[PDB]
Structure 1
Amino acid sequence: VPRTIGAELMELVRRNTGLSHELCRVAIGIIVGHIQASVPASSPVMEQVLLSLVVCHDQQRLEVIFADLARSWALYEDEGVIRCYLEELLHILTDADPEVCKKMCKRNEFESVLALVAYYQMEHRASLRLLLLKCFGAMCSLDAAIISTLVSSVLPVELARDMQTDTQDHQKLCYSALILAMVFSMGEAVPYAHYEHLGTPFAQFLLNIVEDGLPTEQLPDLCVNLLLALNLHLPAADQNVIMAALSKHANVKIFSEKLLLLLNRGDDPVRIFKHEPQPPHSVLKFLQDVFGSPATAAIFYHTDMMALIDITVRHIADLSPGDKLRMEYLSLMHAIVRTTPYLQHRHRLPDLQAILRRILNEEETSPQCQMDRMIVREMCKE
């Protein structure tokens, strides 16, 4: 059995059946496997073919598509043609070999990707823009370097501007919000050239969508998650654009409640992909920034304050020692007692004292419990 039977079979079935990568592997496994099963004494070859499983059509098609779309000439053609182009691009980025797509997108210093962005800036046909957004989302699922490239490019700027411009397009608005929530889910780079396009005004816009809404209701929570993605890598207290937007207008109860729910769930809505050096928790960091200053801490009403306190203390007392979340919740409490009148109400405090006493008396030899220990010892201020 040839040492490269696997990739050869994969390529052949791919090109001649139009099947997907995974489904090609599955088909090969089915045929070879059942042949091995039914016809005994055929196992030596079949098992080797199966072991082998563990230029191409897709590569050259990516070459042709990326080259043609970078020619913009695509603005002076029939919408159906470009539609087929972007459809094929999407299908390739979704169903072909991941390594091929990674290799092709990163060619000539991401020339193809950047050309696709520069093209997206000029294309105003909604269908083509939608397809382009989908393709970008497909690229984000490949590698984090492409995310860094896109967040370094002019794409987020054009997305924000398009969002504030074409508000009467719910679908493209949802997808734009999603792509934006994806490119800002890395938290790697901050270009202040985009801050001139995505500042406190854009934050006020998103918050206005969250609070008031548009004339399905699947754009409000996506705007929330977008605010989470944006505030993932912003400043701390006084130089934060979103926190500035919250400082200007603190009459946001719906958003605060949404944050209370998101904190109650515990899960991160911004953590979508699995890349190296994972970023911080969105909701926790957001609430930390909220209680990094009283003015932003005002967004939680008298009721929502006690509620949030209860949920936080609950998470602290429920999280076992060694968890990488308990430290963040303890930090949030330490910020809440420093930004809010916690001593005035003293709600959920008798249990909090027992929680601190139990946490400090933890004989855990772990480093995480140690960090939680120094944090808690710092929080012990009379």
Structure 2
Amino acid sequence: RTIGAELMELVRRNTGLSHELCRVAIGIIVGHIQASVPASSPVMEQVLLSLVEALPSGQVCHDQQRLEVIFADLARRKDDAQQRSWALYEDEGVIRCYLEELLHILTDADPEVCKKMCKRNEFESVLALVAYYQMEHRASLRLLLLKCFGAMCSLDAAIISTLVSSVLPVELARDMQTDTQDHQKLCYSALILAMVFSMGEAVPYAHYEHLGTPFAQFLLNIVEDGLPLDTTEQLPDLCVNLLLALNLHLPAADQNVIMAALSKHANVKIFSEKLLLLLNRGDDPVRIFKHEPQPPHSVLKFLQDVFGSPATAAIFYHTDMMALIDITVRHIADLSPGDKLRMEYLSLMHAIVRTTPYLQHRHRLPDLQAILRRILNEEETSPQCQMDRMIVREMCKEFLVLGEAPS
């Protein structure tokens, strides 16, 4: 009745395997004794169904016990005011052992266990580590906490709302501007910051003291000039994915803190080069997790906001804008009706004509004119397809030369 769940607990204990491979090992063993010994097939098929399709009453998982023991000590070591500010005993080897064990459980065990024990009592255990991180100064332990937060964001999205609304993104954004020597901590800090901002949820206003415009200039100076200690050159492609994610919850490009960074910078070229290599493929590097509701496309959200003002539009060199128009045009046509993105490329194109002198050089204007007349003459009746046509009319109405026949 409950065999398939009581075996997985036995196997994970005495082998250390993950949840997935625990089910594989049993499905293979059973599925092979069933075939070699047909006399046992009725018993085996019940056993397989228990896997495909709960635990006994008092029996509690091993991974659930450990998370009661780990979250309880780390919160006890947080509430130990003496040992934190006035150290006497050694703590780096014990804490490093509980945080390693935690990272192997969140990474391998069943997510629904690791979800409830983190969602328990209104995220009491998550929010402690977020404070212990603020309290701890040792980078050997700040690094393991980041690897643990990155595993908790993959489980649920309610945890992301808990972290982004907390003080974590303000300490990372403060440790990165200050402690630039540690390369791993600077590269993981920029990963977690992109995780928690991935969903587009808003944040307290107080975060913008350390996540505002001076933090963007710091990230642009790294994207453009790089660091000396960055030998492998991972950090520019992480400080790009982070800027794309900060700009997700930020509305009203005129009021945007990031765009004030671009318009203040002397010359951005490497940040613009990288935005187009992402647009050519239509890949959202911020979208690491498969959590609903799926937020918008981070790149187009950015470029829609770049071209929401003419001060930020002039960052693109001449050769790059023409490559941006060749791409946007190619996607508008290659995309099918009923897609969500087609109005984004259209709204993006509408933003280019306003804030740039597109009507003086008119690059790919004939190929564009033929595509908009098609989209208006499309007889589709979905609501989304009516939103596209609604944009095109506004685009042609504002600029008439986009409605004329190609010539």
**TM-score, length of structure 1 as denominator length:** 0.96
Distance in 2, matches of 1:162 and 1:355, equals 49
Give how far 1:240 is off.
0.6
Q: 1:24 to 1:234 in 2, by over 3 A?
A: same
Match of 2:129 in 1: 116
Distance 2:135 2:18 in 1: 32
CA contact (8 A) 1:75 1:123 kept: no
Structure 1 position 76, deviation (Å)? 5.2
How big is the shift at 1:347?
A: 1.1
Query: Is this contact kept in 2: 1:143–1:275, CA < 8 A?
Result: yes
Q: CA deviation at 1:72?
A: 7.9
Question: Take 1:17 and 1:306, find their aligned partners in 2: how far apart are those partners?
Answer: 58
Aligned sequence identity (%): 100
Q: Relative to 1, partners in 2 of residues 1:47 and 1:308: Cα closer, same or farther, differing over 3 Å?
A: same
- Quick one: distance in 2 between partners of 1:365 and 1:107? 46
Matched-pair contact (CA < 8 Å) for 1:229–1:270:
yes
1:365 Cα offset (Å):
2.2
User: Offset at 1:57?
Assistant: 1.0
Pair 114,221 (structure 1): closer, same or farther in 2 beyond 3 Å: same
Change over 3 Å in CA distance of 1:74–1:10 after alignment to 2: farther
Deviations 1:275-295 (A, max 9, x none): 121100000000000001111
Q: Secondary structure at the match of 2:45?
A: helix
Q: What does residue range 116-155 of structure 1 map to in structure 2 within 5 Å?
A: 116-155=129-168
User: How far apart are 1:130 and its partner, in Å?
Assistant: 1.0
Q: How far apart are residue 32 of structure 1 and its match?
A: 1.0
Q: Which moved more, 1:92-101 or 1:318-327?
A: 318-327
Q: 1:238 is paired with a residue of what secondary structure?
A: helix
Mean CA deviation greater in 139-148 or 35-44: 35-44
2:189 is matched with which residue? 176
Q: What CA deviation, in whole Å up to 9, does each residue of 1:151-199 have, x standing for no partner? A: 1110000111111111111111111100000000011222111111111
| Structure 1 CA distance for aligned equivalents of residues 202 and 366 of structure 2 | 43
Q: Secondary structure at the match of 1:235?
A: coil
Aligned partner of 1:57 among 62, 68, 73: 62
Structure 1 runs, 4 residues or longer, greater than 2 Å off: 71-78
Q: Structure 1's 258 and 302: CA in aligned 2 closer, same or farther, altered over 3 A?
A: same
How many angstroms apart in 2 are the aligned matches of 1:193 and 1:75? Answer: 35
Q: Tell me the residue number matched to 2:274.
A: 258
Q: Which moved more, 1:71-80 or 1:318-327?
A: 71-80
Q: Is the 8 A contact 1:90 1:134 kept in 2?
A: yes
SS at structure 2 position matched to 1:42: helix
CA distance in structure 1 between the partners assigned to 2:319 and 2:203 by the alignment:
36
Aligned-partner Cα distance in 1 for 2:187–2:61: 35
TM-fit CA distance, 1:367 = 2.1
List runs of 5+ in structure 2 lacking aligned partners: 53-59, 75-83, 398-406
User: If the length of structure 2 is used for normalisation, what is the TM-score?
Assistant: 0.90
Aligned positions, number: 379
C-alpha distance in 1 between matches for 2:290 and 2:266? 34
Q: Does the residue aligned with 2:142 lie in a helix, a strand or coil? A: helix
C-alpha spacing 1:366/1:65, structure 2 compared with 1 (3 Å): same
| Matched residue, 2:71 | 66
Question: CA, structure 1 residues 91+73, in 2 after alignment: closer, same or farther (shift >3 Å)?
Answer: farther
Change (3 A) 1:174 1:277: same
- The alpha-carbon distance between structure 1 residues 85 and 159, as it changes in their structure 2 partners (threshold 3 A), is same
- Mapped partners of 1:272, 1:72: distance in 2: 37
Per the alignment, do residues 344 and 76 of structure 1 end up closer, same or farther by CA in structure 2, a change over 3 Å counting? farther
Q: Any idea what the Cα deviations from partners look like across 1:198-249, whole Å, max 9, x if unmatched?
A: 1100011001111111111110011000000110111222211101111212
How far does residue 136 in structure 1 lie from its aligned partner after superposition? 0.2
3-state SS of 1:251 partner: coil
How far apart are 1:345 and its partner, in Å?
Answer: 1.3
Change in CA separation of 1:108 and 1:72 when aligned onto 2, cut-off 3 Å: farther
Classify the secondary structure of the residue corresponding to 1:323. Answer: coil
Q: Aligned to 1:111, what secondary structure does the other structure show?
A: coil
Write the deviation string for residues 332-375 of structure 1: whole angstroms up to 9, x where unpaired. Answer: 00011111111111111111111111111112222222111111
Aligned to 1:279: 295
Superposition deviation, residue 103 in structure 1: 0.5
CA drift of 1:74 comes to 9.7
Residues 120-141 of structure 1: CA deviation (Å, up to 9, x unaligned)? 1122222211111000000001
CA distance, structure 2, for counterparts of residue 345 and residue 177 of structure 1: 40
Residues 74 and 82, structure 1, Cα contact 8 Å, conserved in 2: no
CA offset at residue 250 of structure 1?
5.3
Q: Structure 1 CA distance, aligned partners of 2:281 and 2:222?
A: 22
Structure 1: gaps of 5 or more residues: none
Backbone CA RMSD of aligned residues:
1.7
Query: Structure 2 vs 1, CA of residues 41 and 126 (structure 1 numbering), >3 Å: closer, same or farther?
Result: same
Instruction: Report how far residue 10 of structure 1 moved.
Output: 1.0
Q: CA deviation at 1:313?
A: 0.8
- Measured in 2, the distance between the counterparts of 1:112 and 1:99 equals 16
Work out the CA distance in 1 between the residues paired with 2:155 and 2:202: 19
- Measured after TM superposition, the shift of residue 304 of structure 1 is 1.2
Flag the 1:165–1:76 CA change in 2: closer, same or farther, 3 A: farther
**Partner deviation per Cα, 1:18-68 (whole Å, 9 max, x = no partner):** 221111111111111111111002111111111101221111100110010
Structure 2: distance between partners of 1:276 and 1:15: 33
Structure 2 residue 8 is matched with structure 1 residue 10: yes
SS at match of 1:178: helix
1:343 aligned onto 2:359: yes
Q: Secondary structure at the match of 1:252?
A: coil
Residue 307 in structure 1 maps to residue 313 in structure 2? no
Residues 49-106 of structure 1: CA deviation (Å, up to 9, x unaligned): 111012211111001100100x989995332221111100000111111100000001
Measured after TM superposition, the shift of residue 115 of structure 1 is 0.3
Residues 352 and 263 (structure 1 numbering): CA distance in 2 closer, same or farther, change over 3 Å?
Answer: same
